[PDB]
Design a binder for this molecule. Structure first.
Ligand code: 3D1
Ligand code: 3D1
Ligand code: 3D1
Ligand code: 3D1
Ligand code: 3D1
Ligand code: 3D1
Ligand code: LI
Ligand code: LI
Ligand code: LI
Ligand code: LI
Ligand code: LI
Ligand code: LI
Ligand code: ZN
Ligand code: ZN
Ligand code: ZN
Ligand code: ZN
Ligand code: ZN
Ligand code: ZN
Lengths: 173, 173, 173, 173, 173, 173
């Protein structure tokens, strides 16, 4: 069950996202993780967050979905609290090193990562989603991203910078 | 959570299989279910199974993966007994009519359907799988299909006809 | 010429539709037939049509394009009366069992199937058509579907239910 | 019915070949016609055919499938003599200028074009065909190409040069 | 370095355009060159340009990007004067016969070809571009095409006919 | 010319590799950079290289191809010394921060990165290359990778560990 080999980790590019949403092509988790990393790096800096916090978010961004090489990527609405509890234990056996990183993340780093993880998905669908359901999902994700950010421990000035940058970015995407 | 609308059921063609395996294109569950239906129809008849049994397998084949419109399609190795128990309850809320059909299926109809469901996957990868992992998955599925068939309640003559037809079919695929 | 083998019938998923129209991906006839079957099942029931009629439409839906495994799928405008007459004889040699089903279909079952066959195509292009020609084809098909329905033997109440459901479905597609 | 507009002729790149054969992507008739043109140019010259003959083959190569913008591309085995007779009249209404060119082609130019048209298809499948049926089609086409060439009016020395070049080309494709 | 073999020239269909722009699929240079050829043929005739000029533009259209089989297709904004000077020498070694044709082209033939080369790209993106950057590129190309045409040696009546036909064509694409 | 905005950097996933090689799909530079990063991380550690060296290789891996968002990805054989000299100056204006990182890299970090950059390409083609040219490119890259490694400043024990891991990985890919 545990992922221990580079040949397995390389299969990040074989793991397709958006399994219940029509898209122009099957996005893989490697391109997703790179883009989330980029957002954490750029937007963490734009928001003036401490370097140690941005570094932690970026480190997690690059590995956070590796368990999906075994589990597959499952749709957000399907990940209820009960399923997430079961998946957390399974994922900790698959990638214990990722579980350890997740357990060490500071709340501010976690909230930067989560904002960027959802933002990347909205940005992806803006270009590559097809049809009414995909459009609804894009907009639902954007609402969820904003609600989570607003209720988070991030300072309001940081929240505002993240939304400033998100909106500038999506307009040009 | 429950799927009640035709516009949702049409999204069977938006649900991608093989989320952890490299393939030439993203196969959807609609084409999968049609092909499983075809195999149940043709191979149930070739094996001389009673018409009522073949009909039940075929009816289930056409709807059996509909819950994935909500849950996504998850990889076989990930569906452990504990996860399947949780998924069974969730899936019964998503598509109660499919759960009712599953609970009424005769063992012989279930075993025909399961053979055909796995055979379809092997046949798909024979053409459309890419790389060493996909090749291994194709062959693992074929071994699992044979083991399940051999240990099933189907008469040995039926088992042999199903394997006769499977092998003739894959040679020409 | 006759299709007699399961390995050939499985090639339904190798037969590409929309050969003269730009689309986001090549839809095959297996996913098309599954979706037409679904529409016949759901919309026949919504319209209160007799169970025997809906069953006949659904049975035909699952096999109706099998001859295309040999002939290819040809564009609707190209299928003039003279070509259709020639194709009918060829198709009857390719899939005599499908020709027999077609010759037994009740008019109401035929009109349900034809409505759903065209509706599926409109719905597909709504999501997956690309460019001005594809848009025109989508809208032409919708006009043809409505005209055929209005001139059909189906009761006006059935016609209205079919259009009610079609319009609700396409809005959400 | 007649194609008269550049916007319609540009849809050559919207017309997909291989409608009954699994391929890695949907090849269009524009890339096909360019490649057939290239083969006529290069192999006609290699074979020492008169410039006027090579020019005629090349001119036809660039337009020969334009009627498919209306008719679709249909599979070779389906084009029986009776269907071809009907299609010839339809195609002459669609693209009268192409029909006029075809009626003026010298036999040697026609045989160069036909060799190259089939060779291009073999070469395409060598790279992009998927599965056993596609492999069989590739090899059937190669046999048909050779038989037609051997029975043609082309001098044996020309036949041999065409096969010399075909075999060198496919080895490196 | 020099391209001398048909198997290499056939790789025109392996050379992907739009390497920095999101598109629905990877357009190759063979389909591009066919479409540019078509535009030169049709629009040169519509504009009443001399047959010898249209022929020269068409001949160049069919081969003009062959060096990209070695160099790759590079984005227009990246091709600065300094890079183009270096590329011109490299391309002349790759395809000396294409360089010779380019050096013989009459200015009016060159301007017809260049208009059509850019028009084809705009028309392609109209259908197949995805996202805001692709939209901007489509519109930038259209502005560049118009500016080059207006400043060219082509008579104003020819310029107007080319724009008349371009606008009619894109409206229907 | 300079890339300064997150919306531009996100277009890493819009930049297609393998522009002159047939592949099953268009790989983008984001998935490439993630995979190169992974190889640097895993294989640098397996080889016992100092943490500071592996970190530097990994940092560069994640950004090293960003200039291609403007320049496009060009084929290795085309990047002659003269072209690389010109590109180095252009790329330094596009992404000065990447040029600064490149100029600070220790030789051992550079050689780890270069090994992994080429290995990733071989591994990609092993799964996704199509046809004889792609096969030749895969094997040429593997020979180039080995020659560069053997002539590098890396200790022989490090070279051997890198080849040990590469060969184990490709066998399972
Ligand atoms: N509302 C939604 N409906 C369907 N799919 C969704 C939704 N939100 C996110 N996703 C996708 C994105 C990833 O593939 C996966 C979560 O990482 O789920
Ligand atoms: N061993 C396996 N590894 C990865 N994927 C697999 C395996 N077996 C089946 N599948 C896929 C097929 C369906 O998408 C889904 C089950 O219906 O899982
Ligand atoms: N007006 C039209 N123009 C082009 N293609 C069309 C049109 N109507 C239907 N189709 C397609 C759908 C199927 O592939 C096939 C008929 O089943 O034709
Ligand atoms: N034996 C065959 N089976 C299936 N398809 C075939 C066969 N031969 C040619 N083709 C395809 C190539 C074009 O799409 C079209 C003829 O131009 O038919
Ligand atoms: N402004 C632009 N940005 C990005 N890509 C562009 C632009 N203009 C043209 N192209 C593409 C089309 C061909 O692939 C190639 C030139 O033949 O460059
Ligand atoms: N020999 C070769 N022929 C063609 N393409 C090649 C070759 N080697 C590498 N590549 C590709 C990989 C990247 O897209 C790009 C370099 O990063 O060039
Ligand atoms: Li999807
Ligand atoms: Li997959
Ligand atoms: Li199409
Ligand atoms: Li095909
Ligand atoms: Li692109
Ligand atoms: Li490529
Ligand atoms: Zn994620
Ligand atoms: Zn199934
Ligand atoms: Zn149909
Ligand atoms: Zn042809
Ligand atoms: Zn060009
Ligand atoms: Zn690189």
């Amino acid at each position: 069950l545990q992922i221990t080999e580079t040949y397995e980790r390389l299969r990040a590019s074989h793991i397709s996202r958006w399994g219940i949403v029509q898209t122009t092509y099957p996005q893989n988790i490697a391109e997703h993780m790179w883009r989330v990393w980029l957002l954490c790096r750029d937007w963490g800096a734009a928001a003036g967050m401490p370097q140690h916090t941005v570094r932690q978010a970026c480190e997690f961004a690059l590995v956070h979905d590796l368990a999906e090489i075994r589990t597959g990527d499952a749709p957000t609405p399907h990940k209820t609290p009960e399923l997430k509890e079961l998946l957390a234990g399974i994922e900790a056996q698959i990638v214990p090193e990722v579980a350890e990183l997740e357990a060490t993340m500071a709340p501010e780093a976690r909230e930067l990562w989560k904002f960027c993880d959802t933002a990347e998905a909205v940005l992806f669908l803006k270009v590559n989603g097809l049809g009414a359901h995909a459009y609804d999902v894009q907009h639902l994700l954007m609402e969820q991203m904003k609600r989570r950010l607003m209720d988070s421990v991030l300072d309001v000035e940081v929240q505002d910078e993240l939304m400033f940058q998100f909106e500038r970015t999506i307009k040009k995407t």
